[PDB]
Design a protein around this ligand. Structure first.
Ligand SMILES: Oc1nc(-c2ccc(C(F)(F)F)cc2)nc2c1CSCC2
Ligand SMILES: [Zn+2]
Length: 206
């Protein structure tokens, strides 16, 4: 049921998505090993992902959460990077998209930093990089990220499966790298919706 609608660069909705993509790039502690070396992106395309079934799956769960949490879904817009982008946009988030080895357990991980998600585009740890050149820092090959609507509800704070009892998600607060943004984990696929498919290249710094 999924339809992808291209957004014009002239569209204010394209511009705010791009600004969040570009402005949440940071440097990574791996010196760019997993994700490549870059400070910014070349945005090639932004699409609205539209699927009535999967939206309604998302909002049904959102209401359940919100009623458990004084009418507060605690809804975020967060980045997701995966080798399974295509299956996510077509079938929705489920168990097969979980980062089994994640630091907060087997669940689906999301980042405030677009550049953190970028590290998972070609697999955990960047895998072996792009399929064409086997280059984790490929400046030529087209990448895709999801910009997702995420329901956090009451989130368990971790300074650094099931959500912890009485909670709907886990928040990873960075506690060493002063410039890192938060990372989040949900344990039910129904708590995220892939609103935007972003296609891009990482840009070689001058
Ligand atoms: O955007 C992200 N994606 C993944 C991720 C995606 C897919 C997979 C797998 F291939 F399914 F196993 C594993 C991990 N992990 C994280 C983030 C951003 S927050 C840091 C953790
Ligand atoms: Zn490549």
């Amino acid at each position: 049921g999924t339809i992808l609608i291209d957004l014009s660069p002239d569209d204010k909705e394209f511009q705010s998505v791009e600004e969040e993509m570009q402005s949440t790039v940071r440097e990574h502690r791996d010196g760019g090993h997993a994700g490549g070396i870059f400070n910014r992106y070349n945005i090639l395309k932004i699409q609205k992902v539209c699927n009535k079934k999967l939206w309604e799956r998302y909002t049904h769960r959102r209401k359940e959460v919100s009623e458990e949490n004084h009418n507060h879904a605690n809804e975020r817009m967060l980045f997701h990077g995966s080798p399974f982008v295509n299956a996510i946009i077509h079938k929705g988030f489920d168990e097969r998209h979980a980062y089994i080895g994640g630091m907060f357990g087997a669940g689906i991980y999301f980042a405030e930093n677009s550049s953190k998600s970028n590290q998972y585009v070609y697999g955990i740890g960047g895998g072996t990089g792009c399929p064409v050149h086997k280059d984790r820092s490929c400046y030529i090959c087209h990448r895709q990220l999801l910009f997702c609507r995420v329901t956090l509800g009451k989130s368990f704070l971790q300074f650094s499966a099931h959500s912890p009892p009485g909670h709907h998600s886990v928040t990873g607060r960075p506690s060493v790298n002063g410039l890192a943004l938060a990372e989040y984990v949900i344990y039910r696929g129904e708590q995220a919706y892939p609103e935007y498919l972003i296609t891009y290249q990482i840009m070689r710094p001058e």
